[PDB]
Every structure is written in C-alpha cells, then in structure tokens.
Amino acid sequence: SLNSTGLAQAAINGLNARFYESSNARWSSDEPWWISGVALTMVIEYMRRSGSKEYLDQVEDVIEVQRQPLSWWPSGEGEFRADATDDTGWWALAMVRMYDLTGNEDYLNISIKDEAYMRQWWTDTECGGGLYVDIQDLTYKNAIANELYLKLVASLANRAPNATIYLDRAQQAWTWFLGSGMINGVNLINDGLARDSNTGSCYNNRLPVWTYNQGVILGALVELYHATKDESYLLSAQAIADAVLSPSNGLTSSSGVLTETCEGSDSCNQDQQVFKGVFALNLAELGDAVAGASSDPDAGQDYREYLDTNMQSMYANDRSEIVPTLFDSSTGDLYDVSWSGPFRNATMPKQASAIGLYVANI
Ligand code: NA
C-alpha cells in the first residue's frame, strides 16, 4: 500500500520547491556544494529506476552550470574538479549514473577526467596507497574519498572504452582498502587513517562509524563483481551490510531503523544529515546484484525488507507536507534527519537523504 515511486517524486518536488535555485542551477547555495551532487544523484537514480524523465531538463541545467570552473578552485579547470577529492568523487559518480540513464558519452567523459584528477593525489609513500581528501594540505587519507574513488574506477571498468587499467586500479584500490585497517573487527568502517608519529605506519583512527562510509563501499564492490563475475566481492559487501543491519552495532535501532550516530545528541551537521540516504541507495544496488547472482528467489530479502522497514518508518514519523497557497501550487513532502524521530525542520541534506531511501525502494 506504499508507492515508493510516487513518494520519491513528492520528495523530489519538495526538494525543488524549498531548496532549488533556478538562477544558480543549484540546490541551496548556503549548503555544501558536494551535497548538490548527491541530490543530483538521487534525482538521476529516481529516473533510472522509475523510467521517468520528468526532471531531465533540470538535471541537464545543473550539470551545465556546475561543470564550469569553480570560483573557489579555478585550477581544477571545471568538470567538477574541486579542492577536495571527495567533492569531485560525488559529482563523478553522479555522471556515471547520468551516463547509465542517457547513454550520452559526454557524461562518461566527465567521469574519466574526474578519475584522472583524483588519481593525482594517490600516493604509495604513505599508508602504502590511498588518496588524500584535502588537496591543499594532504594530511588525511579517509574512508569516504577512497570509497568514492574505488567505486569510480570500478564503474569505469564496466563502461569506459579503456576498461583494462580501470579494472587493475579498482582491484589494487580494493586490496589497499582491505589492508588499510579502516574495516574494523565488526566489519564496519571508521572515518579514516591516522599516521604514526615515529614509524610512519598508518592505522584506523577510531573516529565515528558513519553510514555513508558503509554504503559507497557496497556499490564499489557491486561494480567490482560486475567487472569480474567474482562473487567474493559480493560476499565482502554482504558482510559490511549485515554488520549495519545488526542492532548490536548501534547503526540499526531496536525498531529496525537506520540511525546516524549523531541523532541521539541531535548534533547531526549539514554533512551528516545526508549520510543515511547514500547508504540506502547503495544497499539497494547490493540487493539487486545479490538477487541476480543466485537462482534463489529468497536472495537478498533482508536488504529489501530493511529498506522497506525504514521506508514505512520515515513515511509515518518523519514526513511533513508543504502548505499550498493561492499563488504557489507546488506539492510534495519534506523530511527531517531522523527516520524515526519527529519532524522538526527540513534541510536540503535531510531532504536528499530522504529521496535516496524512496529511490532505494523503487
Ligand atoms: Na598499515
């Protein structure tokens, strides 16, 4: 009795009615730029899974304007090449999705430029591999920038005409990620790596376990499986997803709802507000690959049931409708950060995460 497609469209319409800036071809200029890339990913993936083309013109407008040389990083020369490798990775993966939706080689070319850009800050001389997130400072090799890069090369290994070195780079990047220690003893991924002051060796910095660091890695392993047909990549991804679903690890509540570690203290900032939807979209990618890899009709119900359970909870406890007026007839739905808690306000990162959950159920 729940239409995930219609609810995703209502959430996207609510995102546009409250946060889209037509004069800037961007959502919420007061919010981080990379979250506009996540929002573009959610709108693109909605069209891919639902077969709709309703926001195609808007998405093209955002791409055309935001691919220009960024005013805060002109040396990147545009094409989403920014002052941080994870900022670039979010838009790069959005262009991979835009290529999947349209088949236009232009978007694939952007992702190829982004891969070569991010690779510039991969070094073997610290932590035996991995890339830095802070382009200007080069002091932090974290989980999200390396998960985004890994999913990028793995995606290009399935789509780019020169798929050989992208597969070799993806296999080498996953080998480094697995051996880095960021995947801890319960198969969850901490924020990044610290460096020994004397030996130069790198180790898990034990910073918080964020949901989107348990998600992007799943899509990377799904793409690695599609490029190799090796179910070992799916089994590693399933181990990470199963750790998130286990309530003993604190990411899944007693009611079975995905819960960011900052929701209890009500301290989720603009970045953390978008994390949950990114995991949900990537979990749906894993559930699809798992169901298609085995003849069992029971392949991956837990992931589908999890996404469905979280969807109903967000529908009932986290929803709020915009008030239509005599002048503005825009209709849709707004959402807060907690998928079980009350609706206090709606922000663009909160809304983008919302769309990701509905799209993950399409
Ligand atoms: Na190490």
Author numbering: 78 to 439
Task: Give sentences from the paper.
We characterized CtGH76 from the sordariomycete Chaetomium thermophilum, a member of the Fungi/Bacteria-mixed GH76 subfamily, revealing conserved structural features and functional divergence within the GH76 family. Notably, our structural characterization by X-ray crystallography combined with glycan fragment screening indicated that CtGH76 can recognize GPI-anchors like members of the Dfg5 subfamily but shows a broader promiscuity toward other glycans with central α1,6-mannobiose motifs due to the presence of an elongated glycan-binding canyon. Here, we present the crystal structure of a novel fungal GH76 member from the F/B-mixed subfamily, in complexes with different glycans and glycan fragments. Together with structural bioinformatics, we found that members of the F/B-mixed subfamily act as secreted GHs in glycan degradation, which includes not only α1,6-mannans but also GPI-core glycans. Compared to other GH76 orthologs, our findings demonstrate that CtGH76 features an elongated glycan-binding canyon, adept at accommodating a wider range of complex glycans.
CtGH76 crystals belong to space group P3121 with unit-cell parameters of a = 106.8, b = 106.8, c = 126.9 Å, α = β= 90°, and γ = 120° and one molecule per asymmetric symmetry unit. For Bt3792, the GH76 enzyme from Bacteroides thetaiotaomicron VPI-5482T, these two neighboring aspartate residues were shown to participate in substrate hydrolysis via a retention mechanism. Furthermore, the active site and the canyon-like glycan binding site of CtGH76 is lined with seven aromatic amino acids (W110, W111, W149, Y217, W287, Y289, F352) that potentially interact with the substrate, within an otherwise mostly negatively charged canyon. The tertiary structure of CtGH76 is stabilized by two disulfide bridges (blue dashed box), C204–C279 and C339–C345. C204 anchors the loop connecting helices α5 and α6 via its disulfide bridge to β-sheet β1, whereas the second disulfide bridge, C339–C345, is situated within the loop connecting helices α9 and α10. CtGH76 features two wing-like β-hairpins protruding between helices α7 and α8 (β1/2, D268-R283, designated as WR1) and between helices α11 and α12 (β3/4, R396-D413, WR2). Otherwise, the CtGH76 resembles other structurally known members of the GH76 family.
